[PDB]
């Protein structure tokens, strides 16, 4: 399947996205996994991969995906934000704090990410409160 055009990749992306929307997480994971192998530079594939793993409760695996994603798009707040959610479920408050903090910064610099900026701020405060 190596070397598909951007149109197919785009439609394969749509299928994974839709299966994720449908709660069909294991199927969706498999597609994003495939997309991540086909184009190792497109951050959205790693966002998808991460997301499916999160929903399945595979937090560490989700993190691996989100981390690579963040290197691909240094400005994307969704990566540190959901990374932080995974850290939280795993009982890692420093990771969580560090991700919500970074997500706030990235999100605050981008009007498109306003709602996230506040969720990030709110999660950061909850994490800080838990830490004491």
């Amino acid at each position: 399947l190596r070397g598909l055009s951007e149109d197919t990749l785009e439609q394969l992306y749509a299928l994974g996205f839709n299966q994720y929307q449908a709660g069909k997480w294991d199927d969706a994971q498999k597609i994003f996994q495939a997309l991540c192998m086909l184009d190792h530079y497109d951050a959205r594939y790693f966002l998808g991969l991460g997301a499916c793993r999160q929903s399945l409760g595979l937090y560490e695996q989700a993190l691996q995906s989100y981390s690579y994603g963040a290197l691909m798009d240094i400005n994307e707040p969704r990566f540190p934000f959901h990374a932080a959610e995974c850290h939280l479920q795993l009982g890692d408050l420093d990771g969580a704090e560090s991700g919500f903090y970074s997500a706030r910064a990235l999100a605050a610099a981008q009007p498109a990410h306003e709602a996230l900026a506040a969720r990030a701020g709110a999660m950061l405060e909850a994490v800080t409160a838990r830490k004491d």
């Binding site: 785009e10 439609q11 992306y13 749509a14 996205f17 994720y20 959205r44 966002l47 998808g48 991460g50 997301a51 999160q54 929903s55 969704r78 959901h82």
Partner: peptide, 9 residues
């Protein structure tokens, strides 16, 4: 809440 993925084009 899940993750809000970017919609396909």
């Amino acid at each position: 809440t899940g993750v809000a993925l970017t919609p396909p084009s």
